């Protein structure tokens, strides 16, 4: 009977909330007491990437903190250079609607998917120098929202359909299917050990998936609207979220609770991208009001503002060494801050 | 110069990637993008067949101009989370099944879709080429069963051209942005070869406004 199970579900969710409330000793705002403040952080643009000619929807740094990748609304995909300002490669895309990028940890592959429900993976370090499709991943029913790389042999994709998929490259089919969400899944971020990732849906819940087992471990409710951005703490024991509520939350993976709510009265625009800086002290956020922000982590006080664009900032991301940050907005210019 | 031999060649490579990127951006910018939306089984098949999973596009050319028809209506997702991907689209070809009024009625749902798409923040400047198809079925259905069931506000008589104009202005009066955009209504059926001519006439009229705005005459 439906009533013989919905009552049990409500009771078990109440037990979940009670168990959460029992383990909440002190809020992290009370724990970070009498602590040296970060102070205002000065952030100047170092490079400006003036190649694209349309709206930039995604971006991903490499592992050498040297190259970039961008997905503009045109049928192109530029693999930028960071210390200098040149273009390593330009990819003529098969579908102008693209919302995803993923740079290989070894730099040999780039993922690319959008509204076509197809994840196109592009081989870079190839004889007969040219960038060709390694595999055209098929098996999704909605638009693919974000791509991640475990290695050169695996890829984790989050799509509009209420599921996440872990793919294989030798055979282009899925190996696990994380079908546990409701609503469109918008963002995800892998872990330093690449064993767990959390996907963020439009039902305002983040679920911690287990790559090896293929089953969900924890669900993170308590957030208001649909969430569009997730990045882990560099320790891999916490993750931020970004919603259209104009509020960010820093959860944890060992208490399953909330630690900070990152909201301000003057901001009403939703968050589009979230990326921690190294050491986890900072929280960068890609807002919609033509502007970014850098929130301090241990105390939710806001650090220096980050405004260099005139349109919606879609994506941003810190390098793997913590050196630079590249904000890619809806205007065709990226901006590598420092 | 303070640049290496490989660095100068890298700058050369970047510069010609810029040139080949411009040679494609200028080519694609001249092409017209026409988003095609509507209701489920609202006659999109016959119209995508008339003018020559995910998003399925079409490239039909009339009077030497390359068009693009993005049929993203077969997506089955939250429309508000990918509708911002269609910034700068020249027009939105919206199609309403006229004869589907006596069929939980769904023209009210389509009207709610129209007033949510025309008043969207991303589609303020984009015009809507509103289509009204299955007029042959609508004519017979008006004579068979009265139309006043759907609209309690309707009070007119049993005239075909009267009812068609009534629902036309009912759909037209759904926008709160009465000046920033225009709605080009049309009546069409299967036995009509004038649809492509009408949409070309509308796209010429809207690119006239587009380039007048680009020069800042408006």
């Amino acid at each position, epitope marked *: 009977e439906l009533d013989q199970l919905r009552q049990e579900a409500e009771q078990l969710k109440n037990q979940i909330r009670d168990a959460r409330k029992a383990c909440a000793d002190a809020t992290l705002s009370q724990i970070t007491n009498n602590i040296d403040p970060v102070g205002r952080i000065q952030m100047r643009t170092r490079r400006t990437l003036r190649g694209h000619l349309a709206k930039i929807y995604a971006m991903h740094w490499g592992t050498d903190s040297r190259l970039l990748v961008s997905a503009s609304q045109d049928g192109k995909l530029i693999i930028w250079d960071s210390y200098t300002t040149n273009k390593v*490669h330009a990819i003529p895309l098969r579908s102008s609607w693209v919302m995803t990028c993923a740079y290989a940890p070894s*730099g040999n592959y780039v993922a690319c998917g959008g509204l076509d429900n197809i994840c196109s993976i592009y081989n870079l370090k190839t004889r007969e*120098g040219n960038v060709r499709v390694s595999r055209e991943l098929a098996g999704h029913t909605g638009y693919l929202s974000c791509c991640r790389f475990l290695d050169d042999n695996q890829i984790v994709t989050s799509s509009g359909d209420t599921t996440c998929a872990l793919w294989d490259i030798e055979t282009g089919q899925q190996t696990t299917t994380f079908t546990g969400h409701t609503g469109d899944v918008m963002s995800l971020s892998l872990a330093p050990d690449t064993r767990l990732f959390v996907s963020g849906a439009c039902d305002a819940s983040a679920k911690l998936w287990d790559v090896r087992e293929g089953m969900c471990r924890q669900t993170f409710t308590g957030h208001e609207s649909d969430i569009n951005a997730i990045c882990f703490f560099p320790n891999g024991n916490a993750f931020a979220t970004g919603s259209d509520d104009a509020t960010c939350r820093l959860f944890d993976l060992r208490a399953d609770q909330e630690l900070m709510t990152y909201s301000h009265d003057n901001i009403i625009c939703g968050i589009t991208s979230v990326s921690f800086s190294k050491s986890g002290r900072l929280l960068l956020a890609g807002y919609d009001d033509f502007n970014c922000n850098v929130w301090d982590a241990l105390k939710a006080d806001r650090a220096g503002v980050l405004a260099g664009h005139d349109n919606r900032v879609s994506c941003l991301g810190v390098t793997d060494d913590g050196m630079a940050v590249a904000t890619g907005s809806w205007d065709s210019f990226l901006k590598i801050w420092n | 110069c303070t640049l290496s031999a490989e660095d100068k060649a890298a700058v050369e490579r970047s510069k010609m990637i810029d040139r080949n990127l411009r040679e494609d951006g200028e080519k694609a910018a001249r092409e017209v993008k026409l988003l095609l939306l509507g209701a489920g089984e609202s006659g999109k098949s016959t119209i995508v067949k008339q003018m020559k999973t995910g998003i399925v596009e079409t490239h039909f050319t009339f009077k030497d101009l390359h068009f693009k028809m993005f049929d993203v209506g077969g997506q089955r997702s939250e429309r508000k989370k990918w509708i911002h991907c269609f910034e700068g689209v020249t027009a939105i070809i919206f199609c309403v099944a006229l004869s589907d009024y006596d069929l939980m009625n769904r023209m009210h749902e389509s009207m709610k879709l129209f007033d949510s798409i025309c008043n969207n923040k991303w589609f303020t400047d984009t015009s809507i080429i509103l289509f009204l198809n299955k007029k042959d079925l609508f004519e017979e259905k008006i004579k068979k069963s009265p139309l006043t069931i759907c609209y309690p506000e309707y009070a007119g008589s049993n005239t075909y051209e009267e009812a068609a104009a009534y629902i036309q202005c009912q759909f037209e009066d759904l926008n709160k942005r009465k000046d920033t955009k225009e709605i080009y209504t049309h009546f069409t059926c299967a036995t009509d070869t004038k649809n492509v001519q009408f949409v070309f006439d509308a796209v010429t009229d809207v690119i006239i406004k587009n380039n007048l705005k680009d020069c800042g005459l408006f």
Partner: single-chain antibody, 232 residues
């Protein structure tokens, strides 16, 4: 894949000939083609260069202005016309593929070469190792030396390495200092500092026998080094 080059033969001095190769198997329009010659009993000698789309054309001091080079992207071919051939121009002319982006492998593929026989302030790469005997399973550190600090201010050093088996086209080994081109075993590991470089082989088999030339790419005209004959 292959770069077959055609032209040359028994020629008389002064005669003008066109050396052409037909590229087949890559994006010829995206590769900056080169032209490297080798005298019948001497080392390599740079000749010319064309960037992608014929944007940049360079020549060596010997062939400066006297030879004309060009490319034809639609036909996937590379051209180089000689004028006033002299007896000091006999060589085997190799067509060298090269691409220049970050982390690329310039001078990766080398053509088979054409036989040319006509009857009748620079960087110097010093390497005196020649007729040196080698036994399989041993380790040989082929020394090298330049006349200019190849360590540019932009971090990396623009020194390459190449291998030439007896009777075959040259092959790239180490595309910077302390790198390794694709298709090369990890036996070869470069090690250099300033104007002193060595190609360290941890353990060598019986198939990697030949002559090892060094070549700077800091600035043109891309000087080479002498031969290094590893005798079995």
């Amino acid at each position: 894949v292959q770069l077959v080059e055609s032209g040359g033969g028994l020629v008389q001095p002064g005669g003008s000939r066109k050396l052409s190769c037909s590229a087949s198997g890559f994006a010829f329009s995206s590769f900056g083609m080169h032209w490297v010659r080798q005298a019948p009993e001497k080392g390599l000698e740079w000749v010319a260069y064309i960037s992608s789309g014929s944007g940049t054309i360079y020549y060596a001091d010997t062939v400066k202005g006297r030879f004309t080079i060009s490319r034809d992207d639609p036909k996937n071919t590379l051209f180089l016309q000689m004028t006033s051939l002299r007896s000091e121009d006999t060589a085997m002319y190799y067509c060298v593929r090269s691409i220049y982006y970050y982390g690329s492998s310039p001078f990766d593929f080398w053509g088979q070469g054409t036989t040319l026989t006509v009857s009748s302030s620079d960087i110097v790469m010093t390497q005196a190792t020649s007729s040196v005997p080698v036994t399989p399973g041993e380790s040989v550190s082929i020394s090298c030396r330049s006349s200019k600090s190849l360590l540019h201010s932009n971090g990396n050093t623009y020194l390459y390495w190449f291998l030439q088996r007896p009777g075959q086209s040259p092959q790239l080994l180490i595309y910077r200092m302390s790198n390794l081109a694709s298709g090369v075993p990890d036996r070869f590991s470069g090690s250099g500092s300033g104007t002193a470089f060595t190609l360290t082989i941890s353990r060598l088999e019986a198939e990697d026998v030949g002559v090892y030339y060094c070549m700077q790419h800091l600035e043109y005209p891309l000087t080479f080094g002498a031969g290094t004959k590893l005798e079995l």
